[PDB]
Amino acid sequence: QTPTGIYYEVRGDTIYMINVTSGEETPIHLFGVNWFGFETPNHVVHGLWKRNWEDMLLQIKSLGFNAIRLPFCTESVKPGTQPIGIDYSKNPDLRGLDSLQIMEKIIKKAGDLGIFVLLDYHRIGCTHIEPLWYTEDFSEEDFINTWIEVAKRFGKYWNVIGADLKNAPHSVTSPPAAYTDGTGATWGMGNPATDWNLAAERIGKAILKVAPHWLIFVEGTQFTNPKTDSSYKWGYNAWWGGNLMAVKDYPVNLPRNKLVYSPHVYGPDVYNQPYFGPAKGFPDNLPDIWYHHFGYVKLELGYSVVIGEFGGKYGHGGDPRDVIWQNKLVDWMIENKFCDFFYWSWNPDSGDTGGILQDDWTTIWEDKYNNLKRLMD
Ligand SMILES: OC[C@H]1O[C@@H](O[C@H]2[C@H](O)[C@@H](O)[C@H](O[C@H]3[C@H](O)[C@@H](O)[C@H](O[C@H]4[C@H](O)[C@@H](O)[C@H](O)O[C@@H]4CO)O[C@@H]3CO)O[C@@H]2CO)[C@H](O)[C@@H](O)[C@@H]1O
Known part of the structure; x- marks a missing residue:
């Protein structure tokens, strides 16, 4: 059920944090921010050239946030990847630590402040968001195996709520073509190799076998199927x-x-x-x-x-x-x-x-x- 003692789940449309020992069930609200950079060539959250990382977490908490979404790319989560662009006079405790260890320090510190963390597989490489959860060089099994490894390691952190399976599925071509051409994500088209609704099931099952206590966050696509997108005047104009x-x-x-x-x-x-x-x-x-x-x-x-x-x-x-x-x-x-x-x-x-x-x-x-701030009040 859980390596941490904490199990996250949805009841109704509300997210619950469960202490499985005590049996306490608390509903949670996520007042969150994205702090990006683990998905970029820096291989670290940005701004550690101007700030201390802890000072940053403290300031986020001081503004009433209690959640961080942490974008990552494949490289940042494999050991030995080295962060680029950090001021170590501002960050002495980050010296000799790789992109994975900083990621862990940041999450444990966040947890110390009661901050929840959502892990976001933002990019496969570290330059741009691919339209699909695989490329010519990186297969779906490779993507699933990365998530499995992310989930084995970060599932031990109480404050990690789960897995945003792939950032921003989308198309790199226009409809009607985008639906059948195999280069972009679909939903309800039929082809399980492009249909994000079917891939999210596969990747999610895989994650839940190893982090059964996590949540699976599934984004929309850009286009879905022509019958669905045609159902609404702005169907062809989604993010x-x-x-x-x-x-x-x-x-x-x-x-x-x-x-x-x-x-x-x-x-x-x-x-x-x-x-x-x-x-x-x-x-x-x-x-x-x-x-x-x-x-x-x-x-x-x-x-x-x-x-x-x-x-x-x-x-x-x-x-x-x-x-x-x-x-x-x-x-x-x-x-x-x-x-x-x-x-x-x-x-x-x-x-x-x-x-x-x-x-x-x-x-x-x-x-x-x-x-x-009105949303936090
Ligand atoms: O990751 C650091 C990087 O982030 C950029 O911020 C992006 C987010 O990373 C990303 O999740 C999201 O991506 C945008 C994208 O940048 C836009 O090009 C794209 O525009 C689409 C639109 O969605 C469609 O409706 C329209 O038809 O096509 C256009 C493309 O022509 O929209 C997506 C989200 O829907 O949002 C963030 C803001 O763009 C920073 O911009 C960058 O500077 C950082 O390095």
Whole structure:
């Protein structure tokens, strides 16, 4: 049942932490941030050139977050990979430690602060997000074996809630072709080699044999099947990791009490979506978009839905409509009780979204955070 004494599960659409010994069951909310970098060529969370890593965790906790999503790539989780770009005068206790050991230090420290950690297999290599959970050089069995090894090691950390199986499944070509061409993820198409709903079952079973106490977070795709995507006017305009419209007819075949649907959703700073034009109904059009793409999965079907990524520059050097977009989304999440989330990102160095921290890696965008804060209250 569990190597830690803690078992995570979903009841209703709420995530529970169970102390299996005492029998105590606590419902948890995930007020989370993404702290990225283990999936990049640095092979470490970013900003350790400007900050101490512990100081960073303390500051995250001081802002009322109690959860971190930790993106990783294959390399960062194999021993002996060496981190690049760390100021060791600021980080003495990180000297002579590899990308895996830092990852472990960060999680144990987070746990010390009651912070939950979601492990995210973000990239297969360490440069970009592939549309599928395999490449020419890295097979699905290789991907599954990496997850098995991640799960054997990090399953011993009480505060690790589970596995975001693959960051942002998506297409690298357009429909109708994208559905049959074998280069991008699908859902409900039929082909188990591209259909993310079927691959998430395989990879998830594999993880649950070794970390039975974990949760399996399954993102949306970008396109699913033409019948599903055609069912809604904005069916062809979902985010990578964002399209959960096929959950109703093609549910992932996994234990309901272990599964979390985890959509990405973004504003005009990531992509100039047609429904972001006031002409196409922005911003009042947004509740119904979100509903159709992923909101109905919780609100109609009652599964647990955790928004794994959302964010934007909040009018700081980007599209000013992002302020309206972030306000409207928080309003909607509060009204509809989506209280579990990971903001993208803690890091200021996300080129299209910036982060909670400003470019100085020290100070927060007060207004962006203030708006986010309403969800924590
Ligand atoms: O990892 C560090 C890296 O992160 C970047 O932040 C990305 C996230 O890593 C990622 O999970 C997510 O990816 C975006 C992606 O960057 C966009 O190109 C893509 O745009 C899609 C859109 O989704 C579709 O609807 C549209 O049809 O096609 C476009 C592509 O043309 O959207 C996905 C998410 O849906 O979100 C983060 C923000 O982009 C930082 O930007 C980078 O600087 C960091 O190095």
